[PDB]
Symmetry: D2
Subunit: 386 residues, 4 copies
C-alpha cells in the first residue's frame, strides 16, 4: 500500500484543487470550491494540512464582520478534521492594482498597500498556527528594460522584507519567511529569479535569520536548472524553510503538473535528498489539476501527488540500502569527496610534492568514474527492475 | 568614428582570437596563435589588455626553464606594446584528469593538484599586475544524480576558495577572486549555475570580501535569464569585480558570439546599466570567432566587439539625455520607485489609513504605466530613429 | 517619420488591441473594446485593415438577429474608414467545451460542433471579403501520453481540413486556408508544433493547394527556432499565405510582445526576406499590449509595430543596396550558392576528378568565409552606424 | 533479466561506443576503438548489429588498397559474429572543408566533393547489406543572417538528395534515404531543424518515396518538442525509416545520454508507440558514453540502453493489456477519437441540428476527460506499483 497518513506531512494549497481552469486562452471549466470543503475532502485523502492565500479564504472587499466569519468557518473545519495550516501567503498578483508590482511597484501608494495587506494576513497565520509565511513576488519584474531599475527595486524589496520582519519581531510571532522564486510568467522577467538569487538577497537583509526560501520544482525547471542541486545549496545554507512540489515538462509555461510527472528521474533524486537530509518540514504540493478534469479527477490528481512521492520514498531508500549501490558509490569515490582536501593545511599542501611534481596526472586521468554503473543501479531501483 | 582607445578599457582573452575552431563535431580550422602575436595584433586594434589561462601562456608539462621564458617573452610583448593583464585564470577543465572536477573532484589527489596548479598561476598574475583572478568551475558538476553529493561538494569548493584566500592574504597580493558561473556545457549541470548562486556561496565563505562574480552574457542567456538584471543584483551587492561580454542566440550550446550579436536589445540595456553605475573595471570579451573564419575574420570580429559596445554607449547616453525620455521616465514613476516606501516607519505606516482603508485600489489600478511609450523611445534611440 | 499608410498592408487583430490583460495569474486591467472603435482608431494610425475571431464580433450564444446587427455595424465602419477584413478565424479554444480539443477532441459531437462553428464563419469571411482563413489548434494537443493517439488525431485533423476544403470548393469562395502552428500553451504539447510540421500535414490533404501557413514569430522562438529560416521554407514550398508579426524574449510563454522587441536582428532578417521575396500579402500583428498599459499605451503599441517594421524596411533595403555589402556577399560566395551544384549531371560529376581525386581539400578549407565582416556591415546598417 | 537478443534488432554506431571524450572544452579521455573490437563486444552484449560513418571505417586519405583491407577486416568480423550493418552514413562535418556546409556550402567544389564522398559510401552500404542511408546536415546552417539564403540552400539540398536518388535508382540498390533532423549544434541554426521540417522537404523531391526520417530523441528535446508525437507524424506519413535512441535533459547541448535517462516518461511513450505500430526497423542507439567513464563503463552504457528499452517494453505492454487501463481509455473516449468525425458527409453534418442548434454545449463541457486517472495508471505501470 502506498497510502498517505498525516504523518507523511503532505500539504496542499486551497488554490491547487480549487483551480477552476481559467487559463490565458480559455475560461473556467470547474466551479469554485469552498475552503471548508477542500479541507474536508483533502483530509479523507490523507493530508496533514492546507495552506492558503488571503484572497482564497477572505474575499477581496470583505468587511471585518465577513472576515471573522470566513475565518471561524475555516477553523471549525480544521478543528473538526484535524487539518493543519503550516504556511500562508498573500495574493499580491491577481488584482489590477498589482500590475507593475506590490513591494517593488513604481507607485508608492501601491507599495504601501501591499505591505498592509501582507501584515494583515501575517496576523492571521499567527493565530492559526502557521510557522512559515511564503512570498511569491510574481508581479515584481518587467517586460521592458527602462520600466524598472533593478538596483532601486531591490532596495524597495529589502525595505519591505525588513519592515515585515520588524513587525514579526515586535509582535513576537513564531514565524519565518520564505521567498518563492520564479524566473518568468506572469511578468517577462521576475526579480529574484532562482533559489540562488533569493539566497543572496537574504544575506543582504537586516535580520537574515528570519528569511529563507520556498523552492518550486517547475520554477527551476522553467530555467533549465536542476532543482535537486538547488535544494542542496539551500540545505547546505540552512535556508530550506519550505518546499513546493509539482511537475514541469520543459522550458515552457508554468504547467503546475502533479508531482512525479514531468521529469520523473529528478523527482527520484529530490526524494533521495530530502530524505537523506531529514527534511522535517511540510511537503507542500502546488499543482493545478488540468482544466480537462472534474472534481473526481481533481482528487485523483491530489492522491497521485502523494502516491508518487511515497513510491519514490520506497525506491530511493531501497537504492541507498543496496550493498551493490553502496559498493558502486565506493567505486565512484563518493566517500573520498567527503574527505577534506587539505586538512593538513596550506603550508603542508604546498610542501606535498605528491600534489604536484610527483603526481601522475596520467594514471589518475586513466581512472574511470564508474558513474554509468551507479546510475543504472538507480534506474533499476526507480523502475523496480532489481 | 566608433574607434577604441585603450581608455575604453577593452580586454580580450588569448583563447578568444586564438580559438582554432575545434568543436565537438569537428576539427580545427585555424592554426594556433602565439601569445606574443595576439598581444601585438590586439594592441593595434585599440585594446587595453589581454587576459590569459595558465595553459595558454605556459604549455602543460613545461619545465621551469621553459616556463620563465614563455613568461619573459610575454612580458617583453606587453611592455613594448603597452598592454595590460587585468585578469588571469587556470585551465582546470581541458586535461583528462579534470574529467569529474578540479576543486570538487571525487578523488582527493585531483583536488589537491587543482589547488597547486591554481596557486602557481596566482603567483604569476601577482607579478604581472593582475588585480582579479577568475575561476570557472566548468567541470564541477555531474551528468547523473548519485555521482556527486552537492552538499559535500560545496564543502570542497568552500575549502578550496578559503584556502586560495588564505594564500593571497598570507602573500599580501592585491588580488580579488571572481567566480564565472555557467549552468551547463561541458557538464550536464554545473555547480554555482547562476550569478545569484555564486553570490550566495560567497557569503558562506570565511573572507567573503575577497570574492566576487565574473558574469558572462551567454552563460545567463543559456538559462533564459536577463543578464542586465543579474549585473544589477551583483552591482547592488558590490560584487561585480569583473564581467565577460559576448552573444548568445537562445537557450542552446555556448556560442560565445561577438558582443552586440545575439540579443541586441539586452546589450543596449547592459551598456546602459554599466555606464549608469560607473563600472570602472575591465570590459572583457569572451568570444570565439567562428570556425568558418580566417585570421582576418578573427580581428574583424574582435573590432566589432569594440565597435558595437561603443555605438551602444552613444545610443544609451543619448537615450538618458533626451528630455522626452526623462519626461517618460517620470510618466512611468521611476522617480517614485527611488522614494522609500515607509520612511515614516512601520508604526506610522500601520496608522496610515490612506495605505489601506482609505486607499482607492480602483483609481490606482486604472493608472497606466506608460511603459510602451518609454520603450519605443528606447528602440528609436538604439536604432537612431529619433 | 517612418509613418504608415494603408498601402503598407499593415493589418491587426481585434483581439490584439482588444486584450483586457487577463493572464493566468491576474484579472483584466483594461475594458473590452468595440470593433467599430478599433476599426476607426487603427484607421487613423495608418493600417490597411483588421482581422477577427468569430466570438470577437458576434458574442457567443447570439441569436441570428443580434448576429446580423453586429455584422452590419462592423461593415458600416469598414466601408466608412476604407479598412478591409483580409483574414478571419474561429475561436475554438475559449469555451470549456473545447478543453480537450476541437477537431481532435476525443468526443465526436464536439468535433462536429467545431466544423459547424467554423463553416459558419467561413461564410462570413467570404462576405466581408477575406481571402485567407486561419486555423490555430491551441486546444489540439495533450499533457498526458495516453490521452491522445496522435496518429488517430491527425486522421481527425485531415478529415476536418478536408471537409473544410470540400465546402469552400463547392461554394466557389475565393478563400484559402492557412495553419497557424504553435508548439505549446494552452496545452502541454500542441499538435502540428512548427511551420515544417504543418507543411507536411498539408501535403497529406486531398486538395493541398488550398492550404498554407500562418507563421507567428513568437511561436517558432518558443521552440528556439529561426523564424526567418522557417518563413524561407514556406516561401520555398509556396505555402506562406499569411504572416503573424510579434515579439518574444526566448523560450518561455507566448509573450506576444510588440514587433521589434524581443530579437531585433531576427526582425531585421525577416523584413529582409519578406521584402526580397515580394510577400504581397497582409503584414499582420498578433501582439498583446501589455497589461501594465492604458488604452493610450495600447494605441502607442500598434503604432510601434508599424513604425518598427518600416524602420527595418529602410535599413534592410539600404543594406542590400550598399555597394560594400554587395562586395561582401561575393566574398562570402553567396553568388556561388546560386550556381547549381551539378548542372553537368550525375554521370559527369562521377567522371570529374576535380570533385574528388584532384580536389585540393586543404586549400578550400583554408579559404575564409568572410561571414563576420558581412554581419558587422548588417549590424551597422541596422543601427545607423555605416 | 530483461536481457537482449539479436532478434530485438538493437543496433549501435561505431562512433557511439567509440567516442573518445573530446568535447569543446576538453581533450579525449578514452582511446580510439577498432571496429572489429566493437563488433565483437557488442555481439556478446546481445546486439543485432552496428552502423558506421565513412571515416569511422576507412581513415580519411586512405588509398584504395588500404580501403579494401579495412572493409575486409570489418566484414570478416561481421560474418563471424552474425552482426549486420543495417545503415550507413557519411561524415560531412569533421573536416575543415565542411565548415560552411556540405551540400549547402557556399562553394560549389565542396558541394560536389560531398556528393562524391557520399556516393562512394552508398556503394559500400549496398555491399555490406545496408537498407537505409542516413544524412545529417550538422554543418548545413549558419550563425549569421546574410551567410546563407535558405531558399537557395534548399534548392541545393533538393539537387543533392535528387542526384542521390538518381544514382541509387540507376544502380538498382535496395537502399532508402533517411534524414536525421537536428535543430542546432555544431551550427547556430541547422537547416531542416525538426522531423516536420524534413517531412515537408521530402515531399518536394523528385522521387519522394526513397526518402524518410531518422529521428533522434535528443534532437527534438533540444527544441522542447515531444518525440513520441513527432514519431507519430512520421508513422502517419509513412516516413519512419530509422530511429536514433538516446537521452537528453532538456533544452541544452546534444548530451547524447544513454536511452532511458533524461525523460523516462517520454521513453515510456516512445516504446508504447513503437511497439503498438509494429516498427519492424532497427532500434538504433546514438548515445555518447560519458567522458567520465572507462571502457568498462562504455560497455555498461550500451548494456543499459538495451536493458532500459526492454524494461519499458515490459511495462508499456502490461499497461495496454491491463483491463483497468482498457476501461480508463473508454472513459477518456479514446475509442471515440477513432470514430470518423463525419462519416455522414458535409451536406449531412450541415443538415444536423445536434451539431449546432440542439447541441448541449454546457453538458459536453461539464463531462470530465478522466486523463489524470489514466496517467496515474501509466505511472504505476512504469514504476511497478500497480
Ligand atoms: Mg507555480
Ligand atoms: Mg508555489
Ligand atoms: Mg563561454
Ligand atoms: Mg568566460
Ligand atoms: Mg502568439
Ligand atoms: Mg496568432
Ligand atoms: Mg545527437
Ligand atoms: Mg544521430
Amino acid at each position: 500500500n502506498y497510502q498517505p497518513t498525516p504523518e507523511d506531512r503532505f500539504t496542499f494549497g486551497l488554490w491547487t484543487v480549487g483551480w477552476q481552469g481559467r487559463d490565458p486562452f480559455g475560461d473556467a471549466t470547474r466551479r469554485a470550491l469552498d475552503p471548508v470543503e477542500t479541507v474536508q475532502r483533502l483530509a479523507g485523502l490523507g493530508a496533514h494540512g492546507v495552506t492558503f492565500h488571503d484572497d482564497d479564504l477572505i474575499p477581496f472587499g470583505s468587511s471585518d464582520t465577513e472576515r471573522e466569519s470566513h475565518i471561524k468557518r475555516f477553523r471549525q473545519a480544521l478543528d473538526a478534521t484535524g487539518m493543519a495550516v503550516p504556511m500562508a501567503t498573500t495574493n499580491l498578483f491577481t488584482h489590477p492594482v498589482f500590475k507593475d508590482g506590490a513591494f517593488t511597484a513604481n507607485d508608492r501608494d501601491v507599495r504601501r498597500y501591499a505591505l498592509r495587506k501582507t501584515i494583515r494576513n501575517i496576523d492571521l497565520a499567527a493565530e492559526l498556527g502557521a510557522k512559515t509565511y511564503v512570498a511569491w513576488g510574481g508581479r515584481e519584474g518587467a517586460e521592458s528594460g527602462a520600466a524598472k531599475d533593478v538596483r532601486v527595486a531591490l532596495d524597495r524589496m529589502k525595505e519591505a522584507f525588513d519592515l515585515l520582519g520588524e513587525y514579526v519581531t515586535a509582535q513576537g510571532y513564531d514565524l519565518r519567511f520564505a521567498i518563492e522564486p520564479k524566473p518568468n510568467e506572469p511578468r517577462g522577467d521576475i526579480l529574484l529569479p532562482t533559489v540562488g538569487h533569493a539566497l543572496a538577497f537574504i544575506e543582504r537583509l537586516e535580520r537574515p535569520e528570519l528569511y529563507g526560501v520556498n523552492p518550486e520544482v517547475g520554477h527551476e525547471q522553467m530555467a533549465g536548472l536542476n532543482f535537486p542541486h538547488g535544494i542542496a545549496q539551500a540545505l547546505w545554507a540552512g535556508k530550506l524553510f519550505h518546499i513546493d512540489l509539482n511537475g514541469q515538462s520543459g522550458i515552457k509555461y508554468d504547467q503546475d503538473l502533479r508531482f512525479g510527472a514531468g521529469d520523473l528521474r529528478a523527482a527520484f533524486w529530490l526524494v533521495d535528498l530530502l530524505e537523506s537530509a531529514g527534511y522535517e518540514g511540510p511537503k507542500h504540493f502546488d499543482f493545478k489539476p488540468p482544466r480537462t478534469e472534474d472534481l473526481d479527477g481533481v482528487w485523483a490528481s491530489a492522491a497521485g501527488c502523494m502516491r508518487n512521492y511515497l513510491i519514490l520514498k520506497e525506491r530511493t531508500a531501497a537504492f541507498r540500502a543496496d550493498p551493490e549501490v553502496q559498493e558502486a558509490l565506493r567505486a565512484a569515490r563518493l566517500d573520498e569527496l567527503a574527505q577534506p582536501t587539505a586538512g593538513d593545511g596550506l603550508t603542508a599542501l604546498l610542501a606535498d610534492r605528491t600534489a604536484f611534481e610527483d603526481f601522475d596526472v596520467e594514471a589518475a586521468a586513466a581512472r574511470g568514474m564508474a558513474f554509468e554503473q551507479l546510475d543504472q543501479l538507480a534506474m533499476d531501483h526507480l523502475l523496480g527492475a532489481r
